[PDB]
Amino acid sequence: MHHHHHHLVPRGSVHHIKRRDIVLKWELGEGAFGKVFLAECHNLLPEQDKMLVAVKALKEASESARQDFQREAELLTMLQHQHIVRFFGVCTEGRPLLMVFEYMRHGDLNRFLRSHGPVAPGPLGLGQLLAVASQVAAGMVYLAGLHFVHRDLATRNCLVGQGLVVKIGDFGLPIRWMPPESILYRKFTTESDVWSFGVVLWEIFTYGKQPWYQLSNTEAIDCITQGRELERPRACPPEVYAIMRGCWQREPQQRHSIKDVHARLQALAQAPPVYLD
Numbered sequence: 001m002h003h004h005h006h007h008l009v010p011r012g013s014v015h016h017i018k019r020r021d022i023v024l025k026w027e028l029g030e031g032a033f034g035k036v037f038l039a040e041c042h043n044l045l046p047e048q049d050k051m052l053v054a055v056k057a058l059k060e061a062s063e064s065a066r067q068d069f070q071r072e073a074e075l076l077t078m079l080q081h082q083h084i085v086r087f088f089g090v091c092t093e094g095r096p097l098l099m100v101f102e103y104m105r106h107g108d109l110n111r112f113l114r115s116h117g118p119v120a121p122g123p124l125g126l127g128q129l130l131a132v133a134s135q136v137a138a139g140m141v142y143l144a145g146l147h148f149v150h151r152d153l154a155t156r157n158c159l160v161g162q163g164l165v166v167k168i169g170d171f172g173l174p175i176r177w178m179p180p181e182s183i184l185y186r187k188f189t190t191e192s193d194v195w196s197f198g199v200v201l202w203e204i205f206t207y208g209k210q211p212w213y214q215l216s217n218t219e220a221i222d223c224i225t226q227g228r229e230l231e232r233p234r235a236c237p238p239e240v241y242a243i244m245r246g247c248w249q250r251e252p253q254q255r256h257s258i259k260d261v262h263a264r265l266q267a268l269a270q271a272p273p274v275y276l277d
């Protein structure tokens with residue numbers, strides 16, 4: 001499960017939260033092994049007696065998944081950045097085992113883009129789309145610096161919090177977001193993550209449309225492996241499409257670096273370019 005992260009070694013133990021300090025409210029979702037709940041957490045942060053958090057409950061007993069649980073928690077406690085999901089700790093007293101994360105009030109970024117298409121309710125403007133893209137790219141610069149390969153960067157795996165703050169997580173193959181070498185050879189690197197970031201840019205600029213939406217799963221695999229490129233979205237300025245093309249170079253060593261992609265998006269976000277569809 002975490003074999004590709006073997007080079008990442010924790011400095012310290014995970015934060016432990018007493019079960020009685022967690023008060024479950026309602027389900028936010030499920031999926032990947034499995035249930036996510038909104039909850040109140042007591043005695044976590046000094047500033048607030050009680051605070052909202054998101055709690056993931058482990059389904060398995062197992063005891064293989066217990067080893068995976070501990071390793072996952074150890075890796076998540078290392079990820080400390082403004083644009084990476086914030087992990088608060090575990091609860092190991094009793095069953096099921098719990099993982100506690102920061103509550104991000106606006107939910108996943110894919111749903112957010114779809115519900116704010118053509119909080120402040122309404123369509124997201126160019127400056128806002130660039131700000132979302134810049135934040136994801138900032139998170140990816142941090143991951144590249146840690147030599148951490150995400151492997152499933154997609155808007156469904158990002159969260160939106162207070163003031164449109166965006167953070168990268170992984171809520172649980174995402175073939176449509178993968179480069180040819182990942183599909184064909186399961187080669188996952190900083191370079192395959194940058195290709196997926198180019199696909200995330202495409203999702204942002206299409207307001208959360210599915211990549212290769214016109215194709216079946218089989219047609220998409222073949223088209224990616226044969227070298228076809230996603231079309232420039234209507235809301236996408238030329239400056240932004242050039243970034244996508246840089247992320248999508250067939251040769252991984254030719255792809256633009258995430259530091260340059262982030263710096264370019266910062267430059268555009270702090271402007272933005274005078275672009276009208």
Ligand SMILES: CC(C)n1cc(C(=O)c2cncc(NC(=O)Cc3ccc(C#N)cc3)c2)c2cncnc21
Binds near residue numbers: 056
């Ligand atoms: C969508 C919705 C139901 N939802 C889920 C929320 C979660 O916080 C969450 C739930 N389950 C598992 C995780 N695990 C991870 O993200 C692991 C991880 C992997 C890679 C990186 C990197 N780089 C960082 C972390 C987090 C969440 C919070 N607030 C509101 N809705 C939320």
